[PDB]
């Protein structure tokens, strides 16, 4: 057995926002190298844990893994953690229509801050759009505190928050608020990340100085820009100086949307947008005084301490990379919660039909509640009056199901009378082909120290993508939303990550409903699928749910193509 691709994960001192950070890196860099997959293929990726005293898993964000649930890479859900000095063979099955932008990252603790890289399913000459080339734009947060310090604070009976982001990286380069970019030498600066111009372009070069991230383009071309929200905390809003025509053509990987023209991108943790950019002609550059550099300006939204950073859209490798401008290049809207809502529709509406209101047979509301956990004294994020951590159980759910079958499954009847989760197992069961509406209901915090506060959360589903059927302030009202969808003739798109926003001042009475997001999905993919806030600190604090779709007969008949070490913690898991 030889795997098709290999990723080696280690701890290394790397450049992070013009500082040094002891990061969990892939193949020596943060972000890690781009992996390119074919649609309609089986591809094996061996992940080595070369760390001394930390566990690892690798999650393939946005890939449903419908035929390889044991390859989802989710500790407590689909596998034992990969131990130090061992590996795990991941079977990636791409369906023919999976062409799109995804990303891989650790699903252990806060490793995903740094242990993250692009995962591209190639069109193979099948994109319904022309473009001369592509660029990957992968965004990360920089924290000055270590992963261990942040986890200890989050899990302490004297709660210490991580603090706000200390920098935004684009393809491994950016600037902490304590540092300042200076002019970079002309020539290559990883400005071609994701380019097909030639593999060299599949892995960033770490910066050697404090210099701005660069996207290198030629005049008068069209680029497919693959925006990847690999931030562990930040919701970003961003735009390009004097470039106002961005066309979004794909959302969260698979889904071709009818083209939407925007002047800025908003990008939360776990989201991807494929955007066509038409670059200025040599004549238009001549008329801006032979200007060859334009600022990309990116800002955090919806958090207490604003942050602004820059990258450079560069038209000529002969131009030195400029420092950040003394005053802002452009103005990004203060508001985020009404950007392209009830907007994206399928390009081919025929082959992407959202479940109708009539077809929904059950609704599960996940009320997001911050409060002290009485049993532990920890500050936690509850969903539907429960909490879930990657230490909620010893034996991972899917391992238990493959070992015992029916006896490991959650109790459906008990879950229906307890907010959708089984009192005995804290799992959310769904029948195969059950048509669900899932609502995330935001609320004012019960925590003294944040009383009545509402936060914005990027909500992500593992496995099958859902249809986004809307959002709004206050309490979800299904009768009103159904009336809204019908009045608009709205044709929803499939997504795997949507924001649950704060509205207005973001402060209500403790426990008062204060913003919602609604999903619909016909649950077609048996297995064990996490649904969670994609902010790493909120996951540490328990903002996760585990969904078990189907009966044991629907899961155990999916062939387990890995060795017997899958069943126990301590050994390498190899493919077959
Ligand atoms: C790696 O993960 C394993 C498996 O979850 C961890 O070991 C478990 O550790 C908990 C907490 O100490 C114990 O209650 C269990 O006895 C352990 N389970 C098994 C199967 O051994 C281990 O702590 C993790 N290692 C690191 C570095 O976090
Ligand atoms: C990562 O590095 C290993 C050797 O350390 C190599 O064998 C593997 O091919 C590299 N993977 C990628 C995608 O570059
Ligand atoms: Cu993810
Ligand atoms: Cu995911
Ligand atoms: Cu959250
Ligand atoms: Cu996840």
Numbering used by the authors: 11 to 208, 225 to 602
List passages from the publication reporting this PDB structure.
Multicopper oxidases are promiscuous biocatalysts with great potential for the production of industrial compounds. This study is focused on the elucidation of the structure–function determinants of a novel laccase-like multicopper oxidase from the thermophilic fungus Thermothelomyces thermophila (TtLMCO1), which is capable of oxidizing both ascorbic acid and phenolic compounds and thus is functionally categorized between the ascorbate oxidases and fungal ascomycete laccases (asco-laccases). Like common laccases, LMCOs perform a four-electron oxidation of a wide variety of phenolic compounds with the concomitant reduction of a dioxygen molecule to two molecules of water. Two catalytic copper sites are identified: a type 1 (T1) copper site close to the region where substrate oxidation occurs, and a trinuclear cluster (TNC) formed by a single type 2 (T2) copper ion and a pair of type 3 (T3a and T3b) copper ions. An electron extracted from the oxidized molecule in the T1 site is shuttled through a sequence of three highly conserved amino acids (the HCH bridge) to the TNC, where reduction of a dioxygen molecule to water occurs.
The crystal structure of TtLMCO1, determined using an AlphaFold2 model due to a lack of experimentally determined structures of close homologues, revealed a three-domain laccase with two copper sites, lacking the C-terminal plug observed in other asco-laccases. A disulfide bond is formed between Cys28 and Cys236, stabilizing the relative orientation of domains A and B. In accordance with the bioinformatic analysis, the crystal structure revealed two N-glycosylation sites, including Asn37 [one N-acetylglucosamine (NAG) molecule] and Asn65 (two NAG molecules). In the T1 site, the copper ion is coordinated by the ND1 atoms of His564 (2.1 Å distance) and His483 (2.0 Å distance) and by the thiolate group of Cys559 (2.2 Å distance), forming a trigonal plane. Also, a methionine residue (Met569) is positioned axially to the T1 copper at a distance of 3.15 Å. A dioxygen molecule is modelled between the T3a and T3b coppers rather than a water molecule or a hydroxyl anion, since it fits more accurately into the ellipsoid shape of the electron density, while the peaks in the difference electron-density map disappear. The presence of a dioxygen molecule between the T3 coppers corresponds to the fully reduced state of the enzyme according to Polyakov et al.. The linear coordination of the T2 copper by the N atoms of His69 and His486 is a strong indication that the T2 copper is present in the reduced state. Furthermore, since the last 20 amino acids of TtLMCO1 were not included in the final structure due to a lack of electron density, there is no indication that the C-terminus of TtLMCO1 penetrates the T3 tunnel.
